[PDB]
Design an enzyme around this catalytic site. Structure first.
Site, PDB file in Angstrom:
ATOM      1  N   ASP A 205      12.258   0.725  10.223  1.00  9.56           N
ATOM      2  CA  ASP A 205      10.882   0.720   9.735  1.00  9.56           C
ATOM      3  C   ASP A 205       9.954   1.471  10.685  1.00  9.56           C
ATOM      4  O   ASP A 205       9.743   1.049  11.822  1.00  9.56           O
ATOM      5  CB  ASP A 205      10.387  -0.716   9.541  1.00  9.56           C
ATOM      6  CG  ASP A 205       9.244  -0.816   8.541  1.00  9.56           C
ATOM      7  OD1 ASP A 205       8.244  -0.080   8.694  1.00  9.56           O
ATOM      8  OD2 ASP A 205       9.342  -1.638   7.604  1.00  9.56           O
TER       9      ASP A 205
ATOM     10  N   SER B 118       4.948  -5.307   2.370  1.00  5.30           N
ATOM     11  CA  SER B 118       3.907  -4.648   3.156  1.00  5.30           C
ATOM     12  C   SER B 118       2.623  -5.480   3.193  1.00  5.30           C
ATOM     13  O   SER B 118       2.590  -6.558   3.790  1.00  5.30           O
ATOM     14  CB  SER B 118       3.634  -3.238   2.607  1.00  5.30           C
ATOM     15  OG  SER B 118       2.524  -2.620   3.240  1.00  5.30           O
ATOM     16  N   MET B 119       1.576  -4.978   2.546  1.00  6.16           N
ATOM     17  CA  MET B 119       0.314  -5.703   2.428  1.00  6.16           C
ATOM     18  C   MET B 119       0.481  -7.011   1.663  1.00  6.16           C
ATOM     19  O   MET B 119      -0.201  -7.998   1.945  1.00  6.16           O
ATOM     20  CB  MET B 119      -0.730  -4.840   1.724  1.00  6.16           C
ATOM     21  CG  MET B 119      -1.466  -3.881   2.634  1.00  6.16           C
ATOM     22  SD  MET B 119      -2.897  -3.180   1.797  1.00  6.16           S
ATOM     23  CE  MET B 119      -3.935  -4.633   1.662  1.00  6.16           C
TER      24      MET B 119
ATOM     25  N   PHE C  96       0.833  -1.200   0.000  1.00  3.05           N
ATOM     26  CA  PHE C  96       0.000   0.000   0.000  1.00  3.05           C
ATOM     27  C   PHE C  96       0.870   1.253   0.000  1.00  3.05           C
ATOM     28  O   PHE C  96       1.909   1.282   0.657  1.00  3.05           O
ATOM     29  CB  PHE C  96      -0.903  -0.015   1.239  1.00  3.05           C
ATOM     30  CG  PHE C  96      -1.753   1.216   1.401  1.00  3.05           C
ATOM     31  CD1 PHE C  96      -3.042   1.250   0.902  1.00  3.05           C
ATOM     32  CD2 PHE C  96      -1.272   2.330   2.073  1.00  3.05           C
ATOM     33  CE1 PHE C  96      -3.831   2.375   1.056  1.00  3.05           C
ATOM     34  CE2 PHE C  96      -2.054   3.456   2.229  1.00  3.05           C
ATOM     35  CZ  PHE C  96      -3.336   3.478   1.720  1.00  3.05           C
TER      36      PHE C  96
ATOM     37  N   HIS D  14      10.575   1.619   5.801  1.00  6.65           N
ATOM     38  CA  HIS D  14       9.537   0.701   5.347  1.00  6.65           C
ATOM     39  C   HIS D  14       9.622   0.465   3.844  1.00  6.65           C
ATOM     40  O   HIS D  14       9.538  -0.668   3.380  1.00  6.65           O
ATOM     41  CB  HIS D  14       8.143   1.199   5.734  1.00  6.65           C
ATOM     42  CG  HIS D  14       7.062   0.195   5.480  1.00  6.65           C
ATOM     43  ND1 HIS D  14       6.280   0.216   4.346  1.00  6.65           N
ATOM     44  CD2 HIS D  14       6.647  -0.870   6.204  1.00  6.65           C
ATOM     45  CE1 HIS D  14       5.425  -0.790   4.385  1.00  6.65           C
ATOM     46  NE2 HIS D  14       5.627  -1.464   5.503  1.00  6.65           N
TER      47      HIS D  14
END
Lengths: 440, 440, 440, 440
Positions: free
Chosen positions: B228, B98-99, B32, B257
């Site tokens: 992160d 991530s997602m 995302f 991140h």
């Protein structure tokens, strides 16, 4: 109401019948020399117990046609086959009385227990009435039955009077278990029959059913009165029980040959018990089969156990909420859509109280299967076959010939209500669907 | 390019995807609020290393359809399933960011590692982001995430600015590891997404993947940056590593991140290493499969032990002489001709330095059996199919459809005309040949 | 998603569109020079309120095709007609902004309010922007608009910057009601459009809608910001209100031309109010019509009053039990079966919570009508016509051509679920059925 | 009769073949330069012994197509494969002569002993005719065979005369073991062959079958005449016996190459003996199948044991009285009429000396099938299908598609002699009839 079972000369042979109530079909086959209306005390009770009662009059008896041919149990059983097939009865229970037990035995033997769920024999003729060398357990020799035929031919109307005296054991039961008027009605019914059929029927009594008995595979009940004068308990039911030890055996003390009326209370109790017990017995064996098949596709874990629990609850009859169950299914983390779909199909099918849930999209989207026209082609072809099918074992085998993709769409057709199949068949489909998925 | 993953009202739900390069399939699942193009630094490296790169955009992100439904990881994993099945990928590696890590975990859990060879988790959400009583290792409570959704709904465009500020750790990395223009592009990609998807996505972050983790059987890699800000290392990767200790653990010091871009060199290095390692790991599992299949046809005894040892030696890289091995094979007793042939085929195939040895006569006579296999048409049609094949599992399944006699001749064609099929495919054939022989 | 509205040379003209949510269709027509995504703040709210949101991009704008022809409101309205017909929208509400108001006015005028339930005009152009002799209420003369076209042609990208300054009133609203990033996105959307369409669009602004206004018969809403710089309130909305005094008039104080984002809260409130009010307004007028027609067949007495009461209760939304209502109907003393049948149809149709009642036999037996094949022939023929129909007045007229016997069977088809017609049409049928019975 | 084995230019390549008799399939592959009709003395004997004799002509020989391609044993074996697959022969015995032995060895080696039960080699070429360094047991060098080819090319017709002089050892056998006319016919058959095939055939004689021999797993027979001039015993059979020691070895003293005719008596005896072991083995497996199926319908008890014993006795050849068996069957009290009918059908079918016993009434009445014209119609439709059928497994499968009632009547058709089906097919029907009855 009539069902045509044959043709005699210029006329046709039709049987009068009656179809009442909703539920599992129970066919009541009357004895000599009466009609379907004889079951009225049983019929009244069976309708209360939520059964579908079917009665018919034997040829030359009651309101049925009175031909001068076909008075043999092969023809009697052939008539019953026509009756069952015309009405397309499925998972039905056959109940016979006096002569009627012969029809049950012969049909089961000759045509198979495909449509039959269970059988009951009240005041049976079985296994063999004729007293001969090879059969010493016979009630009386040939000469005796020849006397009866000659007696009926002499004067059937006068015969009926003497007949019902031992049919009901009037010296004992008259004024106590059977009224004067009740007997009067029975006589009228007797006289209403055919003159030819009257004297032709006794020749059918000494039919050898010994070969028919082993072919009885469905659950059976054998009921008989000890005070039975027409058919002595020992020459009939007692030896019949040795031939069929698996059968549920009931001996009604002091009951005459006509116990359907006199000892109606004992009869109803015993019969309704046997029916309810045999029904739940086949329900459990069906549901446990469905459970194992459905669980076969679910991956082992804590989720599998939870599913198994909710399945047992609905199968046991614990009225669970369906909106909650479906919301529970929809919200599961590791379950595949097809698995959720199959489960969605199974729950709506087994839950008695739909509560008011519109056909959920998540189940519909699971069963459609990409909406492939190739899959929906095989699905209708299978649907045509399943409409004819009724047995669970029969429905499962023919469904297995189809691919897993075609089966899922077929389930979708039924779920969407574009299809009308019986629950036993519907379970056949889902089990076959589960079987294919398990092997993939 | 698009792949239809669903349907919303009058419109259909299609996911934009890209398929580049030739080799083992590597699926890159973006995070995302970006798209498949985010992997460009990884994709470039992966293409150089001779891989097949497959990227796609999540629903409501990038060039994919923007529906207002199906924003949950069960639907996300279903989409991925469709993608993998539509392209018919086999022995592929899933890489999530991530997602994207959520999709990998859920698909593996729900659909099995059939098509999957290995998995990679970069900047993972796992195991559980939500901070609760049962889960104290959570990053933040429910109320926090409710703020983000409300923040996106307030102004998603203004949200993106603040988001990428911590996504890349701009106070540190801007002008150093990430340029103003690069971020500018990231912002554009974010805005290009769906308005609904934008606010729907944060609710998926606190998904409980704890149940999905144990279902991971393929080789795994867990990478995460220490710096992160979005997904704090201790609440994510560190506890994730405890849940999956078998996984290869990489901690990139000071990486934010969005380390895919900033620390791309460290990411590429670690990832290509893990891929190279998983290849040798699956190479070993391939040889052990070949060993067991070859050993299946050899009868138990002292010869079986000798062969198994000699097989292990060549598999280990202990460069044995081939002229000696072949002479050793030729002189073995109790050996069926076909058995010697199969072993001869395997040895020439597995021995690196063939040294320059002409195609042995005894192997030709052992497999083919003096009959020319080129004349046999069934051998060529299968050979034609195997030329298209690439996977070992794919080559083995299609070969099993042929008779043992046809398979032996097919092996002979490759040995005779110095076959031009990949070693992985060649092993599929021999295992399939062994399987047929093992039964009959 | 795309809808083809034309063809330009070798290429086809397709419009990008989006279809979200379930409920009454609300079409949102964007303004210059943006796209359907502009409604996102309204779209988000409308989806929450249980509406079906439909948005599309005008030709040469957003993701739609960019032809060099058809930039006139007759073509724009023709496109909208195609959109409405392709999706087969029924009882829909049209919402236009800036240029979008022109499409609404022109379509309604040229194609009629058949599919339209209501209309809304936000930041309208109407009635006439051009300042001429016959129209002194114009905002600016021809020469002015020629300047804009020349300005866009000079440099459209640089134009957009200056355009959005007055579109949003940035000196006031920037940093307060609209963020820097939000404006940035709008600019991107503007640039994404066609170069030709950009300069062709302003020529459409001085279109004379004065002739289109009187043709607006459905309920209307006129909304406009006082601080509107692009389209001055007095030259537009104020004179528009004089032309359409029936319309609901809303003046948002201090709102700029782009109030969809800045004053989104005021806009949503006003719009959702108008929609909910206009919906209940047409629901009441429909239900009172159904009531009078149904009561027309019921004979005057205490029973008629009781029926009228239970009808009012369900129409008012008082969630009554359906099993009780149906049991009440079934048990009525003087009511004819057809009357009970019609009533049974009406209650299931209006009751939201079916609670879980299987299609009652007493209703089915009432509607079948002797099961005449002559009646079921006309019933399907009528059913075909009603599937195409949508208006209540339209559905009633075509149904009246059929006999009372044919109508009853047609209602039976729908009740049995062998038919799928909209509620407005279903009410048309029942009212027509009641009308024929009343004249018999 | 023809079987297409290939295609040459505009024409196709078909092989002439013959299929006679009923029983286990025995394929007879002729030698050079004759045809299938050469086996006529063996075929006559094999048909008497109740075998199914299948003969075919090699390409370019006898009545087969005469192409100018495919004259190699890889093509010859491919043709044989096509023949076996087209006829779908299973558990068949291959018998080869001269060149024909080459086909047997190669097919078995290249295609496997799947369809083959046993193999026979008469006047074999095996293992290798060519005399080289590695093969000193060869009959003659390369130069010799080149002479034969050149001899045929010079004048094949004149060649045939000299060929048959040593083929039959005419100086010895003419006028004693073979007549002038018989040789004349052999010459005609030779001339009838293809001109190209004639000279192409000798080059195939020096084929290396040494690698094919080990691949022979079915029971084998090696027969050869000591007086063989064409293929010297020591260079052929004797060394062949060393390669295949498991094989049954038969040496016919003083027999020439064409011993098939001259020493036909010695050949037939040896061959039928070897065949009888494999035939009696397959007869029992057929009868045990019938036994299990017939016993499947008989109800458990002492009677079931009695029937099984009497069945084993008649199957074993113990000439039991049939008049007694039928009277015993007729008089059983617990056996169903259909059961008595089926057993009666089986006993008349399996009992050799029927002793002129008239068609029993009790069996006819059991098989009549209630004289339903619908049952009688389906039985004829099945009878048409069974008339075409030949295999037991094939006859059983197609019969299973018919109802139990239809099957019983079909058996009645055959029993009454209104039908003519082979014993293997007849057993298929009865087994299929039993299967339906067992399932009810």
């Amino acid at each position: 109401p009539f069902i045509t079972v044959g043709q005699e000369n210029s006329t046709s042979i039709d049987l009068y019948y009656e179809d009442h109530g909703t539920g599992t079909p129970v066919v009541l086959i009357h004895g000599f020399p009466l009609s379907g209306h004889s079951w009225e005390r049983q019929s009244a009770a069976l309708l209360d117990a939520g059964y579908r009662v079917i009665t018919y009059d034997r040829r030359g008896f009651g309101q049925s046609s009175q031909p001068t041919t076909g008075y043999d149990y092969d023809t009697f059983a052939a008539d019953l086959n026509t009756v069952l097939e015309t009405l397309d009865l499925q998972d039905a229970v056959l109940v016979g009385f006096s002569m009627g037990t012969g029809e049950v035995a012969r049909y089961v033997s000759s045509y198979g227990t495909a449509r039959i769920a269970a059988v009951a024999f009240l005041a049976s003729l079985e296994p063999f009435l004729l007293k001969t060398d090879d059969n010493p357990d016979g009630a009386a020799p040939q000469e005796f039955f020849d006397g009866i035929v000659a007696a009926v031919k002499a004067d059937r109307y006068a015969f009926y009077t003497g007949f019902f005296n031992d049919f009901y054991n009037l010296d004992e039961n008259l004024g106590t278990r059977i009224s004067e008027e009740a007997v009067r009605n029975s006589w009228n019914t007797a006289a209403s029959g055919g003159f030819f059929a009257a004297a032709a029927a006794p020749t059918t009594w000494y039919t050898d059913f010994r070969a028919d008995i082993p072919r009885i595979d469905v659950p059976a009940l054998i009921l008989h009165g000890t005070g039975d004068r027409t058919l002595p308990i020992e020459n009939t039911a007692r030896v019949f029980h040795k031939a069929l030890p698996s059968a549920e055996y009931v001996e009604v003390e002091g009951a005459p040959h006509g116990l359907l009326w006199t000892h109606a209370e004992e009869v109803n109790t015993a019969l309704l018990a046997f029916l309810a017990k045999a029904q739940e017995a086949q329900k459990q064996k069906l549901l446990t089969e469905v459970e194992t098949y459905v669980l076969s596709i679910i991956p082992s874990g804590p989720l599998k156990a939870e599913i198994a629990q909710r399945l047992e609850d609905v199968f046991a009859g614990k009225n669970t909420d369906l909106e909650v169950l479906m919301e529970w299914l929809k919200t599961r983390p590791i379950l595949s859509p097809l698995t959720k779909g199959i489960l969605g199909f199974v729950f709506t099918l087994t839950v008695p109280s739909e509560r008011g849930l519109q056909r959920r999209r998540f189940v519909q989207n699971a069963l459609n299967g990409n909406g492939d026209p190739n899959n929906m082609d095989k699905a209708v072809k299978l649907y045509r076959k399943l409409k004819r099918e009724i047995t669970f074992h029969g429905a499962k085998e023919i469904s297995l010939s189809y691919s897993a993709g075609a089966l899922a769409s077929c389930m979708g057709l039924i779920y969407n209500r574009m299809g009308a199949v019986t629950t036993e068949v519907a379970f056949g489909l889902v089990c076959a669907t589960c079987e294919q998925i398990a092997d993939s």
